[PDB]
């Protein structure tokens, strides 16, 4: 054939890939951590956005971090080669390097660290897509007019 | 060749390091609301760093923070983009 | 207006 570039990601497998969409609302008590009010239009909005990218949505509602972690390890296990791509959206409270499970802290580390080239093959080589509605910290921008 | 372990990974974060982020009550959180906005007007159009910049952007610009603790009232925020990918991002294709 |  003629001549070919290699400058972009191949987006037309099969399958766009899968969206998976953890949305914590409600946490435990003995956390003190408070309720996410308006998450849920969040999470709506992004399940139709990704829809309609094509992508197989599949949302969560108020994960431990147990729950997270498994869900995480069982979904980087699966056979992802008719796939595209990987989007994890996390919609949580947070700090520097850091998501709440409904009943405390997970590192990012850990979550991403499933999906490395060498961890989940049939994902090496496609963009694994992490979008992260949570805190960094306790910074507050002042801004300037 | 090998390919490193850390690459074709994106972190769109929804606020720079060490930051607060904020999420309204009524209408959702800035960025998500924002990056929606963004995918939907330019998925067929634009490359994803480039829909990640209009997404900064529109955070930057549209929101500001009400509060009745001065502590916490008139503040922005801006995204954070983390790039690891090694090629271009279109969701579309052909 | 809250805070993640
Ligand atoms: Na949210
Ligand atoms: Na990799
Ligand atoms: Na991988
Ligand atoms: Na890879
Ligand atoms: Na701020
Ligand atoms: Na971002
Ligand atoms: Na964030
Ligand atoms: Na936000
Ligand atoms: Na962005
Ligand atoms: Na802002
Ligand atoms: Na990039």
Redesign the pocket.
């Given at each position: 054939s003629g001549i070919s570039l290699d400058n972009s990601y191949k987006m037309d497998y099969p399958e766009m890939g899968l969206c998976i969409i953890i949305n914590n609302k409600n946490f435990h008590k003995s956390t003190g951590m408070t309720s996410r009010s308006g998450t849920d239009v969040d999470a709506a909005n992004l399940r139709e956005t990704f829809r309609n990218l094509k992508y197989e949505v599949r949302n969560k509602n108020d994960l431990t971090r147990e729950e997270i972690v498994e869900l995480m390890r069982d979904v980087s296990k699966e056979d992802h080669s008719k796939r595209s791509s990987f989007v994890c959206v996390l919609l949580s409270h947070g700090e520097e390097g850091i998501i709440f499970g409904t009943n405390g802290p997970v590192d990012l580390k850990k979550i991403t660290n499933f999906?490395?080239?060498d961890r989940?093959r049939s994902?090496?080589g496609?963009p694994?897509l992490f979008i992260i509605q949570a805190c960094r910290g306790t910074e507050l921008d002042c801004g300037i007019e | 060749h090998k390919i490193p372990v850390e690459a074709?990974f994106l972190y769109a974060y929804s606020t720079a390091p060490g930051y607060y982020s904020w999420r309204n009550s009524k209408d959702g959180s800035w960025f998500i609301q924002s990056l929606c906005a963004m995918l939907k007007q330019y998925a067929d159009k634009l490359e994803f760093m480039h829909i990640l910049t209009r997404v900064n952007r529109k955070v930057a610009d549209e929101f500001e923070s009400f509060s009745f603790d001065a502590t916490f009232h008139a503040k922005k925020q801006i995204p954070c983009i983390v790039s690891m990918l090694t090629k271009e991002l279109y969701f579309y294709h052909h | 207006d809250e805070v993640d």
């Open positions: 999906f490395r080239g989940c994902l090496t496609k694994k | 074709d | -």
